[PDB]
Symmetry: C3
Subunit: 492 residues, 3 copies
Amino acid sequence: DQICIGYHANNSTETVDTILERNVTVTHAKDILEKTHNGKLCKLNGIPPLELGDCSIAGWLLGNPECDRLLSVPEWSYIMEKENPRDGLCYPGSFNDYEELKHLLSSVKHFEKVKILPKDRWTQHTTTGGSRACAVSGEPSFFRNMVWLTKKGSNYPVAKGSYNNTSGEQMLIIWGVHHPNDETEQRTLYQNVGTYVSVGTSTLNKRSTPDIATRPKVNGLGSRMEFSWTLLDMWDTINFESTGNLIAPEYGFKISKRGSSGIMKTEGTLENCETKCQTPLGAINTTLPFHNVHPLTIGECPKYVKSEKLVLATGLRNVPQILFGAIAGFIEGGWQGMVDGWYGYHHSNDQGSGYAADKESTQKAFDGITNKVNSVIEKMNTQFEAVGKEFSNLERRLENLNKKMEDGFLDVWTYNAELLVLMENERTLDFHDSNVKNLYDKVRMQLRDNVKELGNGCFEFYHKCDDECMNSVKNGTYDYPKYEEESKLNRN
Amino acid sequence: DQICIGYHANNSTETVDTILERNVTVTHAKDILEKTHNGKLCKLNGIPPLELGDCSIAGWLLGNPECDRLLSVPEWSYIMEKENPRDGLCYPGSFNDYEELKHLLSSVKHFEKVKILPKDRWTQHTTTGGSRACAVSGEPSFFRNMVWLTKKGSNYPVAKGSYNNTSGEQMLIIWGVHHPNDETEQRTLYQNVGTYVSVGTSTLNKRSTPDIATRPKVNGLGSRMEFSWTLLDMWDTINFESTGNLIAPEYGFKISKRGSSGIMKTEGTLENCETKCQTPLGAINTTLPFHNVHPLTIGECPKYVKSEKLVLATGLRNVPQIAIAGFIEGGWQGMVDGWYGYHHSNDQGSGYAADKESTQKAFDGITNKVNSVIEKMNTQFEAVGKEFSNLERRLENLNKKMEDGFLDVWTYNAELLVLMENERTLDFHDSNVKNLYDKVRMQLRDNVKELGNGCFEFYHKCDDECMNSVKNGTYDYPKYEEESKLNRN
Amino acid sequence: DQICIGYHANNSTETVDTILERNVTVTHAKDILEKTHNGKLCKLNGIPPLELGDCSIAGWLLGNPECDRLLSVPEWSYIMEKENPRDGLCYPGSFNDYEELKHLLSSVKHFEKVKILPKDRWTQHTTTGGSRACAVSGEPSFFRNMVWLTKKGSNYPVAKGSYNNTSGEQMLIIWGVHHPNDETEQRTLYQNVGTYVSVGTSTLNKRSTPDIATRPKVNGLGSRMEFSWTLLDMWDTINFESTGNLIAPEYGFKISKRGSSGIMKTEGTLENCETKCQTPLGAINTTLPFHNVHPLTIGECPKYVKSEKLVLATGLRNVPQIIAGFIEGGWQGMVDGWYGYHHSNDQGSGYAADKESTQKAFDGITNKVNSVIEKMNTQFEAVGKEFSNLERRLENLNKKMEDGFLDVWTYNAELLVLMENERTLDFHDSNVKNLYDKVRMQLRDNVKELGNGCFEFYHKCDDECMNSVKNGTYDYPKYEEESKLNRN
Ligand SMILES: CC(=O)N[C@H]1[C@H](O[C@@H]2[C@@H](O)[C@H](O)O[C@H](CO)[C@@H]2O)O[C@H](CO)[C@@H](O[C@@H]2O[C@H](CO[C@]3(C(=O)O)C[C@H](O)[C@@H](NC(C)=O)[C@H]([C@H](O)[C@H](O)CO)O3)[C@H](O)[C@H](O)[C@H]2O)[C@@H]1O
Ligand SMILES: CC(=O)N[C@H]1[C@H](O[C@@H]2[C@@H](O)[C@H](O)O[C@H](CO)[C@@H]2O)O[C@H](CO)[C@@H](O[C@@H]2O[C@H](CO[C@]3(C(=O)O)C[C@H](O)[C@@H](NC(C)=O)[C@H]([C@H](O)[C@H](O)CO)O3)[C@H](O)[C@H](O)[C@H]2O)[C@@H]1O
Ligand SMILES: CC(=O)N[C@H]1[C@H](O[C@@H]2[C@@H](O)[C@H](O)O[C@H](CO)[C@@H]2O)O[C@H](CO)[C@@H](O[C@@H]2O[C@H](CO[C@]3(C(=O)O)C[C@H](O)[C@@H](NC(C)=O)[C@H]([C@H](O)[C@H](O)CO)O3)[C@H](O)[C@H](O)[C@H]2O)[C@@H]1O
Ligand SMILES: *[C@@H]1O[C@H](CO)[C@@H](O)[C@H](O)[C@H]1NC(C)=O
Ligand SMILES: *[C@@H]1O[C@H](CO)[C@@H](O)[C@H](O)[C@H]1NC(C)=O
Ligand SMILES: *[C@@H]1O[C@H](CO)[C@@H](O)[C@H](O)[C@H]1NC(C)=O
Ligand SMILES: *[C@@H]1O[C@H](CO)[C@@H](O)[C@H](O)[C@H]1NC(C)=O
Ligand SMILES: *[C@@H]1O[C@H](CO)[C@@H](O)[C@H](O)[C@H]1NC(C)=O
Ligand SMILES: *[C@@H]1O[C@H](CO)[C@@H](O)[C@H](O)[C@H]1NC(C)=O
Ligand SMILES: *[C@@H]1O[C@H](CO)[C@@H](O)[C@H](O)[C@H]1NC(C)=O
Ligand SMILES: *[C@@H]1O[C@H](CO)[C@@H](O)[C@H](O)[C@H]1NC(C)=O
Ligand SMILES: *[C@@H]1O[C@H](CO)[C@@H](O)[C@H](O)[C@H]1NC(C)=O
Ligand SMILES: *[C@@H]1O[C@H](CO)[C@@H](O)[C@H](O)[C@H]1NC(C)=O
Ligand SMILES: *[C@@H]1O[C@H](CO)[C@@H](O)[C@H](O)[C@H]1NC(C)=O
């Protein structure tokens, strides 16, 4: 009669990496890293994003004639923008604090356009002016959200405008100043030289003077237009005053919804699909804690890491046993007939052979491994990860600072995850061997000298053991005093 | 005769966490997180703070009439300010590089006010101007540290003033420029239009022109005042020149003491107490690696982690149940002398004991373990706090992301370290008990008989001296050889 | 006849650290931190650096008469500069966006010079101005790369100038505006009051007005000069216009080579040596992952930490024996392996060693060391950044970021080394005990354990017997009858 102790082996080919060995075959493994995406841009939470196409943020807000599809925009989840948009500032010029405006637009999910200074109120000036830089059907045109004030007759009276924010929320207002190319243009358009543009609110005070000089021609013009913005608070007034070179606003943008969003730089188009996490390459439909698709992401998303594989070993080592002899134990290798658990027995008494499994040790090890996996997974913080920021070309030091901070944090977390996986894999691999040896030691200690240790994990008895005795050994209820006299006689 | 190997147990309730099992009761434990405070604002190292009250830093430095108790201020440790103070710039306006000034004030612990430009030297101008936005008992007043210069008669001559820094340290000087509401105010205050204000030092050059326009009324006035500042070095000179719209300084703030300080944003009042670490909610009296009270602390304080529990297992696992059994059946609730030990049952009488060697080495190892976890933590002075304007949102976001990421890194590090360390400690105790059992078996050989419950049943009658020998490591197998062999057969 | 299981011991005095114990003597150890350096400033990859000496970047780029040796600088790898250079802006003034220029200079490597506005083109102005601040051999002089335009006779016509960037790469252009001290100076130099200087490119639009005021005297002058720069793109044009107070450029700086470079603040001189990693204190010749010389480095350089010691245990504990086995201590006679045996039969005694266990342990330790070393990424880092007096918050932010990352890495390295040392020292004991258990399991009941790690045989075990026991092919049935007879 025999009784042996061993573990479970199968035909799995999965491999894991530990700290002292690489490419170790395991029975079961878990992948906590996702590397796949659908390669499409979709709807977030059911709300489609805003597709700017070839337009830019400045072109959308100012009202470029090539951006007439965005004159009435519904609620959005994120903004899609190209790297180098073609239709932006049709009239050559600049845009002060552009990056700050783009950053503000990363927490706004809806705008409401309100007419604050109607065009017909300028009854002492000329409001129908344009340029061939922004041309519709050949004839010159202008921005659809701004008014160009020129002289009426042969005089330019002082232009005064005001607006009291009785809308209900913060309002965004944009104005501009025109810089001519020669004194001829200035005297043809505004009738006087030495003009000023003054804009004032409760917490704002600005006075700009036009610059007239010969400049290189961009879009066929040697002139420029400088744009500035402000955020008017509730129950607050904005005052405009100018002697010349004022590009007045007709519309003001009211922040109607607020939340978390961002600007995604991509060259693709939207497709009919839904998702909960959006990368510039495609959506992610996952429950795993990590991914390595793209750093920048919008929505609740797994952490990024510069890794190619991260596998957690949740099973035993796969060492298979290699003439109608006696089945060995855990010393030689695993068993392929034990399919009901991880650790078990094998009896060879008179009433047939057969395998079995020990439920207590298997349950304990399963609970421990599940707890380890859940501790690794669930001690990671997940939130909104809008990590897109823009910097001008006078802000190289700030851009380098942001790049270094992001790279350092990403490298730190990569190191953390990789080393954690390595140590945990080694610890679980040693755990399984410790458990098997502990079960063997318990069996030997409870069986005492009634048996004969064979040296390969098996126990040759000294008495005749029935299935009742075998289950007693498995149950840990073996009655040593009962068989003492019988076993002692056959020993010598 | 019987000898057994076991471990000590008690009636504890403290629970630790292990990466494999949660809620494991332990005999001893060490909490390395502090979660309490006194809820009061106290004195840092015996020096009281500067309680601004309803005043702002601009109001304190400019001389707001409602902050007359701050004209002379002693040495301080930190500044207490409200989130939205009331008495700031009584005259509506702005302040250039306000956040830079507030950051500079974070390393200054005392100021000395020096009269650098008296009011009586302006003998060619009028220096009694005032406004009703800054009013005392109904009549108009003005800032106490500044002079408003106005025409004397019907003339405003060119105003010139210079100062040489012979005080002995760096000096802070604040001036201002007035922006009227209409040309009428400009002409009845300064007699001419097209004025300038020029300030020049060895490393500074600034020229400003007033802006006259209609603005929404704040505090009743459509005018504004714009203030600037500079840091004058030792043995350096500052020049002032203006044809109008100049608010000249009367006093300068010399930096008398330097060090580490900060601005704490609270709404409370100072009380009578001492401390070493201060938080906006209260003071901390602790000597532990970690705390979870408030992020923005002033002083040498433990790192902040978003953890509600961080307990290091120092003692053994608590299995209460134990003739008498050994370590397989569980722990002993009667061995109150040490950690590992024995239990003998010879004919003289039963009794417990303790193994001094194993207990001492385990104690030293656990002590070194705890001290390595604790004394690897840099704790220097850091007054975490910075202010940004409404046009510096990107910088504010960068700073917030930096602090949040560092905090998350440190919480993950601490939690993982505690979990793995506790697992290793419990495994260490189990291994030590097993090693003691194995050593006893190895030295005791076949003269005894294992029972499977951790105990050994001898074959020779063993007295007290023999038992102290087997606990000593000086057991003599050959002497009990023939006697032991006889009865075993 | 005996066979024993033991481990190696020697006369080393190395010491490692562990999470449970400190000052542990080991047979073999590896130091993974380098604390030594050459002490000299060398050539990076065979290319010598740029030695500014007593000059500043502004002085080099403007043409300070004292810096007359840097008019034709060759290719370089990094720039050496002093903390407080002496020869800089000889004429007192400022330099707008100076730190941005210094940041841009950390990625260029040659800076070819191109004459864009030759001085002879100004036929309607006087171009021979100078000052005693920048005085050579007593007589007044001026910057060698700049032109000071004054009036000719009693007129100052409008000054215009253009340059189309057809060089083949980006260019750097610097101009200036002069601020006088009084109206007498302004009328003596430019003949008109109320002047302006206008500069315009396809993406720049700046207009400046002179400031006339009395200022403290620096270098004997109460007047100042303000300098600004721009980066002209390819096939772009820059326009200059002024009615006075213009310091026009004569040269432009075309970027010829781009790559990784930097600025080092040192007070030393270049010495004849070659290196690949350079610190402000010296050079590093290394094969080790770590170093604790100086935070700021240029080149292929190791990682930096606040660590005074980082030693990885690659061997056994040194517990020499005062023939016993592994219970007492190591053997000072086993010179061919980590774990081994010692036997004594009627041929003779002698030590030996195991091959499989020693090889497995060697491979495991080597893999551990290589994993610790090779998971640390390295790359070129431009740590050095400079900030102005009104950017204290940004400077503090940068300092806090660098310090925090560096303490994080220091803590990680320390904990990794401590836990790995504990793991190795437990691994060795586990391996020796596993060998002992394997031998006992194979040898069964035909022998007699003696407690110290040795086995006393019950039969007469010869040399072929002993190699069989070492091999793992011990025949239990062959000696079963003989062993059982004498045991009874
Ligand atoms: C309205 C118009 O066509 N003006 C042109 C100007 O005309 C003079 C007219 O005002 C006067 O009464 O009579 C004389 C003849 O006796 C002229 O006809 O003449 C200029 C040259 O002589 C033209 O200059 C050219 O303008 C180009 C630009 O056209 C646009 C543009 O595409 O930007 C469009 C409009 O003409 C105009 N917008 C208005 C008036 O509201 C803008 C305007 O010039 C902006 O200030 C841009 O600079 O220009 C090119 O700029 C070209 O380089 C220039 O020679 C006038 O178009
Ligand atoms: C000094 C004074 O009372 N000025 C008031 C001004 O009167 C003139 C006086 O200077 C002249 O000699 O004679 C005429 C009569 O022939 C006046 O009496 O009249 C203004 C109305 O027309 C008042 O304006 C109002 O001022 C308000 C603010 O008043 C104060 C203030 O408390 O801020 C009063 C101060 O005395 C005055 N002067 C100084 C030197 O600080 C300041 C000054 O105007 C500031 O510079 C304000 O920018 O103003 C309100 O602003 C109100 O809206 C306005 O109508 C003059 O008070
Ligand atoms: C060219 C010259 O010698 N100018 C000095 C000036 O003289 C006049 C001359 O131009 C006119 O035709 O005739 C009168 C007599 O009828 C004068 O001879 O007189 C000034 C004092 O009265 C001197 O002033 C001093 O200049 C110092 C600086 O000298 C330099 C310098 O080294 O920086 C000399 C340069 O030649 C001069 N000119 C140019 C074109 O660079 C510069 C120039 O003044 C700078 O722009 C200064 O902002 O200055 C000191 O500045 C000292 O404080 C001052 O009194 C003139 O040197
Ligand atoms: C482990 O596998 C990887 C890829 O499967 C291979 O590159 C590497 O050489 C393997 N390791 C060894 C020790 O062969
Ligand atoms: C703006 O409107 C609100 C509400 O109608 C009013 O209280 C406030 O006085 C108005 N502003 C001004 C400057 O009158
Ligand atoms: C996305 O994942 C969910 C699991 O929550 C699954 O039910 C659904 O079918 C998946 N959709 C696609 C398109 O893969
Ligand atoms: C551990 O105990 C806490 C209460 O002390 C309980 O909230 C938690 O669910 C328990 N966890 C487990 C795994 O039993
Ligand atoms: C300021 O005072 C110091 C010492 O009294 C003196 O050396 C210096 O020349 C003075 N400054 C000026 C501009 O005279
Ligand atoms: C135990 O060992 C110590 C060795 O220092 C010895 O002095 C003592 O007598 C021993 N005890 C007994 C009972 O032999
Ligand atoms: C240690 O032993 C080696 C033998 O290889 C010898 O060369 C060396 O000098 C010895 N060192 C000391 C300090 O005894
Ligand atoms: C123990 O280690 C410390 C370094 O932490 C060292 O200064 C000291 O000399 C060492 N002592 C011994 C006895 O090795
Ligand atoms: C500058 O030169 C380029 C040559 O490629 C030419 O295309 C361009 O028109 C020139 N610029 C101007 C303003 O003519
Ligand atoms: C640098 O170290 C290497 C060893 O890795 C050595 O071969 C070489 O000669 C050394 N060079 C110098 C200049 O020290
Ligand atoms: C030991 O094993 C080797 C296997 O490489 C074999 O060649 C040799 O004959 C064996 N020796 C004995 C004595 O079994």
